[PDB]
Amino acid sequence: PNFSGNWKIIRSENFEELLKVLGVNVMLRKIAVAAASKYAVEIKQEGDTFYIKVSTTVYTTEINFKVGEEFEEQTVDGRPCKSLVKWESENKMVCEQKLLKGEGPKTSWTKELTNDGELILTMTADDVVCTQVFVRE
Ligand SMILES: *C/C=C(C)/C=C/C=C(C)/C=C/C1=C(C)CCCC1(C)C
């Protein structure tokens, strides 16, 4: 698996519907969808250790994890969570998340490297799945 790379988004499906579940009001959802157009993911993978940097025009966040060990990050709408990533197959991993404080929809995400050289990210909140497709820069 070579997840490593500089990935740029080419398609984003159901993102607004995802943010709706997460309680984001309509004007901010529209502004967020527009911001997801200028949006890049940088991945460094060594074995089952990952470094992931997610960037938009004005904001950037870094994620560090090892497959199989709990780490802390944030949900899509920004609330801290405990996360755990496992492989589903050679080139797909799934992350389950647990809210640190409080309650909300069940969130998770997946990353997959296709045989065509695309990266596919899915983000889920309850029954809503957002799919985003990236290609290498
Ligand atoms: C493994 C890749 C992951 C976990 C990517 C997560 C991506 C996000 C949490 C993206 C969030 C965004 C917003 C909350 C609004 C602005 C646009 C995005 C897509 C960068």
UniProtKB/Swiss-Prot annotation:
UniProt record, GO biological process: embryonic forelimb morphogenesis; epidermis development; fatty acid transport; positive regulation of collateral sprouting; regulation of DNA-templated transcription; retinoic acid metabolic process; signal transduction
Effect the entry attributes to changing R29A: Loss of ligand-induced nuclear import
GO cellular component: cytoplasm; cytosol; endoplasmic reticulum; extracellular exosome; nucleoplasm; nucleus
Ranges in coiled-coil conformation: none
Keywords: Cytoplasm, Endoplasmic reticulum, Isopeptide bond, Nucleus, Retinol-binding, Transport, Ubl conjugation, Vitamin A
UniProt PTM comment: Sumoylated in response to retinoic acid binding, sumoylation is critical for dissociation from ER and subsequent nuclear translocation.
Subunit-structure text: Interacts with RXR and RARA. Interacts with importin alpha.
PANTHER family xref list: FATTY ACID BINDING PROTEIN
Name assigned to this protein: Cellular retinoic acid-binding protein 2
